[PDB]
């Protein structure tokens, strides 16, 4: 059973499903049929958060490199309106790897491939004033473009990136986990593609839709602000089902909690990139690892209690 798998294809599995348990998980990378030098870096983000009372604050875990999650607060009992804007929270060291300008993203490295997405929620409130509920479902969001004509002289039809499977966010998905705030919750996301492919890095994308573009013209339900190009930024879109989390904060509630993120991810170094020193070729393919990853991804609940991380 567990003596069948290759050793590299195991540190890979721990990094994927149970990253919380082994304090340290460097990982040997993905046992993909493909072997090439690459660097396996696991991202960990710790964030203590206070929720606005009387308001459902929504959170997004998307497969975007460098940034663990997105958040916006909306009045209670309601879902995000077109007017609502989301803000990111980089992972420690974002600035370092993707430069300062949207023009610098690609210099540190060329492409990426997502391993796992792991999220933790730990209630940090007193049992006396805590109130509310946590709800979670996974949304199959993918990134694509939309072309629409524009009148200029001469007139042309500019084409740009847009996001699909977006509106799935507004309504509470059929497949979900719901529980009282106090119990908190842990959950992860699996690859939404048959094979693991390398997605390229994208430059010049501070926000979607991008400037000079009217929302809805995109068909997208709401807007995504990366913010200052130097502060934060958007690199790419991994083949990972983005996770969605709603937190209902009934008015007069005292709800705070610690948040942890485990994104096991692999990139490819550029020789000029000083990071290249620690690059080790993708470990040779191990058939059973691939069976297990797939098998267990499919066998796991949408989400689980916090105390059972």
């Amino acid at each position: 059973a567990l003596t069948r798998l290759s050793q590299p294809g195991l540190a890979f599995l721990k990094c994927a499903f149970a990253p919380p348990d082994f304090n340290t998980d460097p990982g040997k990378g993905i046992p993909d049929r493909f072997e090439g030098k690459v660097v396996s870096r696991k991202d960990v983000l710790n964030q203590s958060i206070s929720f606005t009372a009387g308001q459902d604050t929504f959170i997004l875990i998307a497969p975007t490199p460098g940034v663990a999650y997105w958040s916006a607060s909306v009045p209670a009992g309601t879902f995000p309106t077109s007017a609502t804007t989301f803000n990111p929270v980089n992972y420690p060291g974002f600035t370092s790897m993707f430069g300062t300008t949207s023009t610098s993203r690609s210099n540190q490295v060329s492409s990426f491939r997502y391993a796992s997405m792991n999220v933790g929620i730990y209630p940090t409130s007193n049992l006396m004033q805590f109130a509310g509920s946590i709800t979670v479902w996974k949304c199959p969001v993918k990134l694509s473009t939309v072309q629409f004509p524009v009148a200029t002289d001469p007139a042309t039809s500019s084409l740009v990136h847009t996001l699909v499977g977006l509106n799935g966010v507004l309504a509470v998905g059929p497949d979900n986990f719901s529980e009282s705030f106090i119990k908190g919750v842990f959950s992860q996301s699996a690859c939404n593609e048959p094979n693991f492919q390398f997605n390229d890095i994208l430059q010049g994308i501070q926000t979607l839709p991008p400037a000079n573009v009217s929302l809805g013209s995109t068909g997208q339900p709401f807007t995504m602000d990366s913010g200052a190009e130097a502060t934060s930024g958007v690199v790419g879109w991994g083949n990972m089902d983005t996770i969605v989390i709603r937190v209902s904060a009934p008015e007069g509630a005292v709800n705070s909690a610690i948040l942890k993120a485990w994104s096991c991810i692999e990139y490819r170094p550029n020789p000029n990139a000083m990071l290249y020193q620690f690059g080790h070729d993708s470990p040779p393919l191990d058939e059973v690892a691939l069976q297990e990853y797939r098998t267990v991804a499919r066998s796991l609940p949408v989400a689980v209690i916090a105390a059972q991380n």
Partner: peptide, 18 residues
């Protein structure tokens, strides 16, 4: 039951089932 055991439980379960 912890998480590495809801993981290692379906491992010896699917690997043994075949």
């Amino acid at each position: 039951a912890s998480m590495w055991e809801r993981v290692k439980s379906i491992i010896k379960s699917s690997l043994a089932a075949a």
